[PDB]
């Protein structure tokens, strides 16, 4: 089955004294400047972005097309390649998981409709306008609302051509046990704290977070960059590092049965027929991390560790006699309650720096390993 997988990626290191070395392409050995860790896959400095992306994201996108949910974390110290893995630089050798994922999603879906047909509604739902109403909304929206960049050409199969679809993104930040919508229409010049809660389907969501409709990989990246502008607003109004907070970018594939007897591509009007699947990409705060800020980060990452360990034991246990996931011990873990209770697919990418300076911090990062062996 599709249990949680943890993979590890070494960043480039031009030194003679490494704190860890890759062995089996699925194993890593500790090196004092005494433990061996086993992962589902180990990437070396030679493994480029394209290799990571296919091994890390293609099966999650295939999940998305199947109407199932997926969750991907990047974990590690600052300067570990965590942001490089996730986003990188918009070049052929530099682009990370997120833009390639957006590219492949938009390459692989069919029957993508125009905007304002689907639209977000109360309590984490979507409704459906009639076409002429949506048409004016588009021209109402267009009153509101230069990338030379590498683009992934990969097209995956598996989209349900009996479904019509639209793509919505939410971009959310968890900083100091408070949750913020980086896509909020901020009026006061301050981001509003947001509540993490469930809907009637028991699915977690951010109450007042904005679901932004995007028609292309390009448009989705424009929205992502807008969120990055908000993400850089520190408490002291300086530049806040991505290591200081958790960033949650959720790609939603909103689907509905295609309507017959029309020359257009349009859903059936019954909104209860809507199916929504998620691919959620999370760029965790740096594991090395303003005192309450660092305590929230270590509390949340420690809760995450405990939760995936409970998740692993539950995946081997029976229907009864399975143990509670302590997901309420942090805001971050609460937001992914469904995944940590075994719904959907979770993949964690442990980014580690082989430099001997990051030795002790790699010991905590490699503790996420599926299993461990001692010298």
Residue numbers in the entry: 25 to 57, 70 to 181, 188 to 331, 341 to 426
From the paper:
Kinesins are a large family of molecular motor proteins that utilize the energy from ATP hydrolysis to move along microtubules and transport various cellular cargoes. Zen4, MKLP1 (human homologue) and Pavarotti (Drosophila homologue) are kinesin-6 family proteins. They walk to and accumulate at the plus-end of interdigitated microtubules, playing a key role in formation of antiparallel central spindles during cytokinesis in animal cells. The kinesin-6 family proteins have two characteristic features: a long NL and a large insertion in the motor domain.
We crystallized the motor domain of Zen4 (1–441). The final structure was refined to 2.6 Å, with Rwork/Rfree=21%/24%. Interestingly, Zen4 is in the nucleotide-free, apo state. The structure reveals an ion, rather than a nucleotide, is bound by the P-loop (L4 loop). First, the ATPase catalytic site of Zen4 is in an open conformation, with the Switch I region (L9) moving away from the P-loop. Second, the N terminus of Switch II helix (α4) extends two helical turns and moves outward, consistent with enhanced microtubule binding in the apo state. Third, the nucleotide-binding pocket of Zen4 is occluded. In contrast, α6 of Zen4 is partially melted and ends at Phe419 (corresponding to Phe318 in kinesin-1), which is almost one helical turn shorter than the previous structure. The NIS, starting from Glu421, flips backward, forms a five-residue β-strand and becomes disordered after Ile426. The backward flipping of NIS mainly occurs through backbone hydrogen-bond interactions with the N-terminal β1c strand, becoming a part of the N-terminal antiparallel appending β-sheet.
